[PDB]
Design a protein around this nucleic acid. Structure first.
Ligand code: SF4
Ligand SMILES: [Ca+2]
Length: 222
DNA sequence: ATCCTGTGCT
DNA sequence: AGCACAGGAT
């Protein structure tokens, strides 16, 4: 696989098209983390004002850690999935109490926190700390399944481990955050669930699904 | 190594 | 009423 050329085309596209979303204002692991939790459950159009309101109320990890659960829930109200904010709240309290108030940059340690799974670990650590971990969410699974014609069920850990291995092989190690962000952004804007915009895709020349005319059949979910 | 869960959609 | 979605699940 011509990974360097792929990285060039993907990252050049990302340089031009990257959305100036609120959670991209800085690289605070706390803020990235909050935005990833919101985006896991809610459309970007709705997350935008909730994120700003949430971070206004709780600007830093310690601010959230120290807030009463009532205040946290009030800030979440309208987003639903309240157990997921309760878990975030417990996790940042644990960060304050056992991890010096700093999000661990060890994927293993960060993963032990309540609610924190492989994707959240990869997103937060690569975006905020530049740790070369894969950040494979639904968007990335769709992009990789198409590029590499992966027809395995994406609900399976074996399939996700394969996607993880692909990212580790093709990642731009000089900027893992940008690389991971770019794959997610491509999935959001171009390589969409239905009718992907293949004709204006920056990595079309690399894509096996486009070449075979089966992009809309991918990814495979049982 | 999942399959479960809250949610939205039709 | 039943299905799709989307990640973490121990
Ligand atoms: S060419 Fe189409 S299917 Fe392939 S990655 Fe680009 S948008 Fe996705
Ligand atoms: Ca975990």
């Amino acid at each position: 696989f011509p990974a360097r050329e792929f990285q060039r085309d993907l990252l050049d596209w990302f340089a031009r098209e990257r959305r100036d979303l609120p959670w991209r204002k800085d690289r605070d692991p706390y803020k990235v983390w909050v935005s990833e939790v919101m985006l896991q459950q809610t459309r970007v159009e709705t997350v935008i004002p909730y994120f700003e309101q949430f971070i206004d109320r709780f600007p830093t990890l310690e601010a959230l850690a120290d807030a009463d659960e009532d205040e946290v829930l009030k800030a979440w109200e309208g987003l639903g999935y309240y157990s997921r904010v309760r878990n975030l709240h417990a996790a940042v309290k644990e960060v304050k109490t056992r991890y010096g108030g700093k999000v661990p940059d060890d994927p293993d340690e960060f993963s032990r926190l309540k609610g924190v799974g492989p994707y959240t670990v990869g997103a937060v650590l690569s975006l905020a700390y530049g740790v070369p971990e894969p950040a494979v969410n639904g968007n990335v699974m769709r992009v990789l399944s198409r590029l590499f014609l992966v027809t395995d069920d994406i609900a399976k850990c074996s399939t996700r481990k394969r996607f993880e291995q692909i990212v580790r092989e093709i990642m731009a190690y000089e900027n893992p955050g940008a690389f991971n962000e770019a794959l997610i952004e491509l999935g959001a804007l171009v390589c969409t669930p239905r009718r992907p915009s293949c004709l204006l895709c920056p990595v079309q020349a690399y894509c096996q699904a486009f070449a075979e005319g089966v992009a809309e059949e991918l990814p495979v979910k049982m």
